[PDB]
Amino acid sequence: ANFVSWKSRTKYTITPVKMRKSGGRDHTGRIRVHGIGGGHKQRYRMIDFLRFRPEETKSGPFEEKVIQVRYDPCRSADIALVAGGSRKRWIIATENMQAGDTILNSNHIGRMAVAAREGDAHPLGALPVGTLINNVESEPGRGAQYIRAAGTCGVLLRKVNGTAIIQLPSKRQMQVLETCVATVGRVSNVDHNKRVIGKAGRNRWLGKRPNSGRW
Amino acid sequence: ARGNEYQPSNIKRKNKHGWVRRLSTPAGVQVILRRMLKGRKSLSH
Amino acid sequence: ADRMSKWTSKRGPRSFRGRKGRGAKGIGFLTSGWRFVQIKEMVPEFVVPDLTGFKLKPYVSYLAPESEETPLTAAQLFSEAVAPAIEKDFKDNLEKYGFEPTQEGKLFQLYPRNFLR
Amino acid sequence: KYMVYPQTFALNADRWYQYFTKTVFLSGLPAALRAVACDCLLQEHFYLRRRRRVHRYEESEVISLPFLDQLVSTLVGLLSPHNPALAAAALDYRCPVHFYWVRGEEIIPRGHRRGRIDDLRYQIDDKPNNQIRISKQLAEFVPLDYSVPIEIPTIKCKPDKLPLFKRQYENHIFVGSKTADPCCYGHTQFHLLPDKLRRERLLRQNCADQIEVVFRANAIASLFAWTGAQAMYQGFWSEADVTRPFVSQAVITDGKYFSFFCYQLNTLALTTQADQNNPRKNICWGTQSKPLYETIEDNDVKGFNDDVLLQIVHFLLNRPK
Amino acid sequence: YEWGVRSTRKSEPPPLDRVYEIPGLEPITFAGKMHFVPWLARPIFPPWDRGYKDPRFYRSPPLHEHPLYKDQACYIFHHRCRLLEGVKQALWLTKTKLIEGLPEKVLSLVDDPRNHIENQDECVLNVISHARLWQTTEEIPKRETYCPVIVDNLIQLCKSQILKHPSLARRICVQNSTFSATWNRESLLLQVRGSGGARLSTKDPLPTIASREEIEATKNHVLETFYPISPIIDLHECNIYDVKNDTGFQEGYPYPYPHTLYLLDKANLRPHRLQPDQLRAKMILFAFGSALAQARLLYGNDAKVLEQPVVVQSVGTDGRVFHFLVFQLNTTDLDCNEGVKNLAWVDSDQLLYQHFWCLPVIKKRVVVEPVGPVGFKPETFRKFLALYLHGA
RNA sequence: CCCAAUAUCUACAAUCAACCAACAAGUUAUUACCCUCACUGUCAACCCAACCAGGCAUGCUCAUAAGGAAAGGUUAAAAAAAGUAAAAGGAACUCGGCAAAUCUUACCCCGCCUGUUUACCAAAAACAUCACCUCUAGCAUCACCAGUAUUAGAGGCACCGCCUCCU
RNA sequence: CUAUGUAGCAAAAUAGUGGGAAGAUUUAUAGGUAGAGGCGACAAACCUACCGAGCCUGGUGAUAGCUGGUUGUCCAAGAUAGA
RNA sequence: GCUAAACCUAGCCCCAAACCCCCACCUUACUACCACAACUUAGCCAAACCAUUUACAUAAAGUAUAGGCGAUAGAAAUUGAUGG
Ligand SMILES: [Mg+2]
Ligand SMILES: [Mg+2]
Ligand SMILES: [Mg+2]
Ligand SMILES: [Mg+2]
Ligand SMILES: [Mg+2]
Ligand SMILES: [Mg+2]
Ligand SMILES: [Mg+2]
Ligand SMILES: [Mg+2]
Ligand SMILES: [Mg+2]
Ligand SMILES: [Mg+2]
Numbered sequence A: 001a002n003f004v005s006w007k008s009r010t011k012y013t014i015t016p017v018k019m020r021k022s023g024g025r026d027h028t029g030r031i032r033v034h035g036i037g038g039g040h041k042q043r044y045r046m047i048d049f050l051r052f053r054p055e056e057t058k059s060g061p062f063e064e065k066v067i068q069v070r071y072d073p074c075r076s077a078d079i080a081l082v083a084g085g086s087r088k089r090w091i092i093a094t095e096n097m098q099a100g101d102t103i104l105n106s107n108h109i110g111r112m113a114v115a116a117r118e119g120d121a122h123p124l125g126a127l128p129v130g131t132l133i134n135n136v137e138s139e140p141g142r143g144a145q146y147i148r149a150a151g152t153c154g155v156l157l158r159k160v161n162g163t164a165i166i167q168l169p170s171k172r173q174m175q176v177l178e179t180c181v182a183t184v185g186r187v188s189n190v191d192h193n194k195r196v197i198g199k200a201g202r203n204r205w206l207g208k209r210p211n212s213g214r215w
Numbered sequence B: 001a002r003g004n005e006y007q008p009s010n011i012k013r014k015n016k017h018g019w020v021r022r023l024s025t026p027a028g029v030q031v032i033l034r035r036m037l038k039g040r041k042s043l044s045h
Numbered sequence C: 001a002d003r004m005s006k007w008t009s010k011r012g013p014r015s016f017r018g019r020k021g022r023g024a025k026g027i028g029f030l031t032s033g034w035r036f037v038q039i040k041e042m043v044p045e046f047v048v049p050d051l052t053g054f055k056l057k058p059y060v061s062y063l064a065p066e067s068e069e070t071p072l073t074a075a076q077l078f079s080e081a082v083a084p085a086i087e088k089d090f091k092d093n094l095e096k097y098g099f100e101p102t103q104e105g106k107l108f109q110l111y112p113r114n115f116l117r
Numbered sequence D: 001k002y003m004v005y006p007q008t009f010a011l012n013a014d015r016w017y018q019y020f021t022k023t024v025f026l027s028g029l030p031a032a033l034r035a036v037a038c039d040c041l042l043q044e045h046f047y048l049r050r051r052r053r054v055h056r057y058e059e060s061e062v063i064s065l066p067f068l069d070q071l072v073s074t075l076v077g078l079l080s081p082h083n084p085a086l087a088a089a090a091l092d093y094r095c096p097v098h099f100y101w102v103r104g105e106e107i108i109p110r111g112h113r114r115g116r117i118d119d120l121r122y123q124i125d126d127k128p129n130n131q132i133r134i135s136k137q138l139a140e141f142v143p144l145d146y147s148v149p150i151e152i153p154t155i156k157c158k159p160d161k162l163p164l165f166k167r168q169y170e171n172h173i174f175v176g177s178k179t180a181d182p183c184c185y186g187h188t189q190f191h192l193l194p195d196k197l198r199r200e201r202l203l204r205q206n207c208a209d210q211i212e213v214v215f216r217a218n219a220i221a222s223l224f225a226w227t228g229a230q231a232m233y234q235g236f237w238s239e240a241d242v243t244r245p246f247v248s249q250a251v252i253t254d255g256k257y258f259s260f261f262c263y264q265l266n267t268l269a270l271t272t273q274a275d276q277n278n279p280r281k282n283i284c285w286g287t288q289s290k291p292l293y294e295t296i297e298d299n300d301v302k303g304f305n306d307d308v309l310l311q312i313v314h315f316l317l318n319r320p321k
Numbered sequence E: 001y002e003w004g005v006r007s008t009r010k011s012e013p014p015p016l017d018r019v020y021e022i023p024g025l026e027p028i029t030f031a032g033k034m035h036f037v038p039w040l041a042r043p044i045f046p047p048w049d050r051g052y053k054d055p056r057f058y059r060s061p062p063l064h065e066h067p068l069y070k071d072q073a074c075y076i077f078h079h080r081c082r083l084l085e086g087v088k089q090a091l092w093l094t095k096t097k098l099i100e101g102l103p104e105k106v107l108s109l110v111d112d113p114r115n116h117i118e119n120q121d122e123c124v125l126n127v128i129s130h131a132r133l134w135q136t137t138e139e140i141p142k143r144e145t146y147c148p149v150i151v152d153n154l155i156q157l158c159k160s161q162i163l164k165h166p167s168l169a170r171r172i173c174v175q176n177s178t179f180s181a182t183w184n185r186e187s188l189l190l191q192v193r194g195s196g197g198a199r200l201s202t203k204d205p206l207p208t209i210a211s212r213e214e215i216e217a218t219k220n221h222v223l224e225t226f227y228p229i230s231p232i233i234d235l236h237e238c239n240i241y242d243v244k245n246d247t248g249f250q251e252g253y254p255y256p257y258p259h260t261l262y263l264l265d266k267a268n269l270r271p272h273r274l275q276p277d278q279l280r281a282k283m284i285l286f287a288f289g290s291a292l293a294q295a296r297l298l299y300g301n302d303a304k305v306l307e308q309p310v311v312v313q314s315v316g317t318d319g320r321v322f323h324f325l326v327f328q329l330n331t332t333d334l335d336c337n338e339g340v341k342n343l344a345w346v347d348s349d350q351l352l353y354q355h356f357w358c359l360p361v362i363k364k365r366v367v368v369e370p371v372g373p374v375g376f377k378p379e380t381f382r383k384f385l386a387l388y389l390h391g392a
Numbered sequence F: 001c002c003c004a005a006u007a008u009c010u011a012c013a014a015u016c017a018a019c020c021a022a023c024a025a026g027u028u029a030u031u032a033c034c035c036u037c038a039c040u041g042u043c044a045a046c047c048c049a050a051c052c053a054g055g056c057a058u059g060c061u062c063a064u065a066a067g068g069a070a071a072g073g074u075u076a077a078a079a080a081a082a083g084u085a086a087a088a089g090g091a092a093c094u095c096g097g098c099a100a101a102u103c104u105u106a107c108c109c110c111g112c113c114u115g116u117u118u119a120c121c122a123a124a125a126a127c128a129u130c131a132c133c134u135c136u137a138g139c140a141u142c143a144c145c146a147g148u149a150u151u152a153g154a155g156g157c158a159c160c161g162c163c164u165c166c167u
Numbered sequence G: 001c002u003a004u005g006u007a008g009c010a011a012a013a014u015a016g017u018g019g020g021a022a023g024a025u026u027u028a029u030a031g032g033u034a035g036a037g038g039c040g041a042c043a044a045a046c047c048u049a050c051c052g053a054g055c056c057u058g059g060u061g062a063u064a065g066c067u068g069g070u071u072g073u074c075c076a077a078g079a080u081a082g083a
Numbered sequence H: 001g002c003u004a005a006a007c008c009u010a011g012c013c014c015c016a017a018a019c020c021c022c023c024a025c026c027u028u029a030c031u032a033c034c035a036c037a038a039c040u041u042a043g044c045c046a047a048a049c050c051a052u053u054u055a056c057a058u059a060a061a062g063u064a065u066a067g068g069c070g071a072u073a074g075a076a077a078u079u080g081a082u083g084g
Helices: A200-206 B009-016 B019-023 B026-037 C014-019 C074-081 C083-089 D012-018 D035-044 D067-077 D212-231 D307-316 E087-094 E120-132 E144-160 E212-218 E276-298 E379-390
Strands: A064-069 A078-084 A086-092 A102-105 A121-123 A130-132 A154-161 A164-169 A172-177 A181-184 C028-030 C036-038 D002-004 D091-094 D097-107 D117-125 D130-131 D188-192 D245-252 D257-265 E074-078 E096-100 E173-176 E177-185 E188-196 E199-202 E237-238 E257-264 E305-317 E322-331 E342-350 E353-355 E372-376
Touching: A064 C074, A086 E199, A102 A121, A200 C036, B019 B026, C028 E322, C036 D097, C074 C083, D012 D212, D035 D067, D035 D117, D067 D091, D067 D188, D067 D307, D091 E144, D097 D212, D117 D212, D130 E074, D188 D212, D212 D257, D212 E199, D245 D307, D245 E177, D245 E276, E087 E096, E087 E342, E120 E144, E120 E353, E120 E372, E144 E257, E144 E305, E177 E276, E188 E257, E212 E342, E257 E276, E276 E305, E276 E322, E276 E342, E305 E372, E322 E379, E342 E379
Parallel strands: D002 D117, D188 D245, E074 E188, E096 E342, E257 E305
Antiparallel strands: A064 A078, A064 A102, A078 A086, A121 A181, A130 A154, A130 A181, A154 A164, A164 A172, C028 C036, D091 D130, D097 D117, D130 D188, D245 D257, E074 E237, E173 E199, E177 E188, E199 E257, E305 E322, E322 E342, E353 E372
């Protein structure tokens, strides 16, 4: 099967791009994961997760101000378009982010813990013990892979020489270098649990279909 | 009711039985060669 | 479901009906928006001579002598083309007698053929 | 229904369009404006410089159509003093003109309908470059029963043999706006020929008495379409023939050469039954084509003529008395 | 997280045949027989260069080696660009203060009734309709065709006011207007290349609208600053441009002095239509560009405070909402962030008509909102023709 | 039947698009080019069903301006098929009010509902389905996914509330 | 659901009566999944009229303790323990 | 009396000998004209199932040998080689 995956874009831009659904079909052509297909057409907004990325030929902590916090089909959380310097980025927003707010993004580990606003991005070591974080990264300068879903809080547990132990939402710990950049707060779209979809048609709209088999 | 399984279409007919589709795989070249040997004057659809 | 009859431009859907030519040469190229540009150079300009005063006709009288078939061969052409000049100049280094060593700087190349009948 | 094209390459299409229209054609006739006209001519040709270089295939779309737009807009803007009609007028840029009529019958020559008699429908669609519509009808040129010695030429051959092709789409009568528009009557139309039909393309062709054919064909077809649509907007049609002559004017230009036409529709009864004996004819009253100027060298316009501009303003000065 | 999955990039070239890395050997490759063969070595051919270069397959040299290439990054504002913060961003870029509401002088040029066009109210109403209900063969015309006619025939409606004064037939409407104005701001070399239409010019340039004692009364005002957004967001940062101002034409023109700029966001789909704020910002920048081009033509490229301020107008519209701007330039001196500023009076969100119904609205055959415009406000037209009349 | 190259961009729906209300979230600046209309479809009573009361997307006419012919001639037997009418009685027929004529009511079992299924004997009390529960999984560039525990996959059950003698 | 039809107009139709008909709907167009595999709102349902495992060619003249057959004239001997 | 019934060769089978032969066309083949690659026979079938197993010059010799030592498989040394 001539299946060139759609995820072929290289340059970054805030404009939505044209998703092509898969239906569970992998590159060969066979149902690899049952229960996928159909549903509303969607476009993809390239949300950028390295929340500490300085613009071209600049450095040092930077401030950005939001513009809007809109629905996103692909995520479960609500993305936000942050403007800074001469650059716009899509970033996952936390619960209490309104249009017009401002957020700091720093890699500067202070002498001691700096009381951080509930949307800013700081290195793990820079935060105090007992706060809530999102968009954690496994290792520095990599990107956010851990907590990103809707309404998920990640507690910071402790710090030791060069590392920090954080608690993931699944009720278990993990170690990460203290220079890993996280965001303090709770991911947006809280109480997304309580979405009684009501009827099978909604499931079909989202993209799921009922599949018997799954040998 | 059955019997009308052939809904003709030139694009499909030329795509799934044509000269280039045969020549795009060893099995197809074998098919063309069999039909060259048997004498056919309709090698490819 | 017919595979014996020839395949020509009258057969497929719109796309096929358009793409397939009918043996006709091209004279130009498609530009943007399906606009066609013609090139005066790719259109064969016929070269017809002046037939006035010509003393030959489509046929030849039945009162003509016969002869033998003697096809022109490279030797026969060379014999009366350049040889006499050689012999005349043999009584006292080849391009002077019509030899053309290379065929890039002439309009009608002999091999490959860059001209037309 | 046949698709009649006002701007047509077909040879001698003028007389064919006469037959389809029951129109006779008569050869003859029924201040710093020169400064502003030449200034618009220059500001579209040489003065105003484009960013992307001019190519000679859209030259009749970006250096000759704005020329007519400016000419008509300025003349209408400054001539409102001398004619209050233009003031509360309706100026339309590239608005569509459609007419749909029936003339003749033919016996279907093949199929499961052979022998059976069917009407010979026509359809004219036209994008006039500029047009001026008014709210009070103009004054007819000659009365409604102007018998003339000239007779409509007869085409014995089928319509197709002059390149003319059938099709089937919506049928549309349209003067430039729907029925509700008060400015339903019509005053003037300015047409710009595409480059296909221009002088130079037919100069590679080696005939002279065919250049005016395209002008005449464009005039006849487009003015008949417009006038007929005006008529049928008032309730008239073939079986209720118009009582008052309808009239309109057209200026047809290729960008350098101009011609003028004064058409007067008398009859819509063109069906075979309603044209049984109706001796009304439509009339055209066109002129030849003259050159507005000679050339545009650097900044002047050598040989700029004032007769053509005078005729244009003349046609714009008409009043609905 | 890099962008671009591996399986979509060109390819890793196939591993080379080892015969090449034997120092004395010249391999046997299939270049002798002009066609691929899978049991020889893949050749290595010279990079092919066309002695000619056909136009249909030309490949431009990269942006670096163009003759007009400048190291410093210009910030152009051409038609499609859309300022993020909008009005105040344009103010900063132009060093001006937004004075809400049109100036009293022009708004007092229409209060007198003698500047009335015949049957004004009903004629503007039927012009609205003619543009929006009777224009084409379909029941509901679209914006791409009814945005331009509203303006292009409202100006014609007002243009019939020559009878009162024969000095009105002294101006023309032009299309295809391309004016380029380059200036500087805090070592940011900005340019504005306005390629639009619906501009009208005049022989006699417009008068100053603010007193010489009011242009100086702006120094006290502190030009607004936004943070952390740069003043160049959404501007086209280009290394290909020119330090050269052109008004869009050349020497010796009747009607050379611009009067008003009409801007037409006529795209059918909303996302291709500039928001209100973006539209006002576009108006401000285009007007300032025209004014600066005129100033450069009159005086030259010298940063200074103008003795004779040049004013321009602009109306931006989509078809039912109108924005009016009067912009008075008084300084070519712009590098500094203090001094004499230019003035900009703007009226926004001015509705010519609240809504339009093209087909009758029926609940139970009790038609409630019949065909036509609902919520017409002639005051928008009052201000429109006011801006038109000023400068007579 | 198409398009010269490179960079830039390309945040806000569509619904008469304006009011309310939502969710399923819907090209240009530079460089190169002053060339013109060639080539093909164009017919018919037609195609897929071996020749055919079957199958066949869209636009427009909504009963026709277009298109057609249910009876080879006769007589008016039975049995058969379709239809119309019917005295009094009105389910006594029958496995059952199937068919037909008339239009109302009440309950009980099963399944929550709309939907899907055995192309060609079963459309259901089966499958699916919102809701709930259980099990597994700490995470890169070809599916799940350009996703990250309120997520993804695999299972059971089936919203919600209440519990683990007459005829 | 009933009646007609059962080599029928049709290798599943016709006439009436019916369920849905802004949605988990219906549908034209090109592409994909290939046979112990695909697909499946699981019915062993469907994958070109016949699928508890497509179709074609080859091994293949498969094998068959089973069924059916086995061709001129005339004569003569010729039958029911058991392992 | 119809229907029919009759015919010869067109060719072919097996040997011997000799080693055999203008244009368009891989895109939708038969279309004048633009930026990846190729390199162990399983099993029907016998063993009356089936599971190891089961065949692809003459002579020596169906011998040595192999084999649920069953069914079956099986050498070598040496010997000498135009016609119907
Ligand atoms: Mg036709
Ligand atoms: Mg009829
Ligand atoms: Mg009959
Ligand atoms: Mg009969
Ligand atoms: Mg009865
Ligand atoms: Mg149901
Ligand atoms: Mg046997
Ligand atoms: Mg037995
Ligand atoms: Mg005996
Ligand atoms: Mg056996």
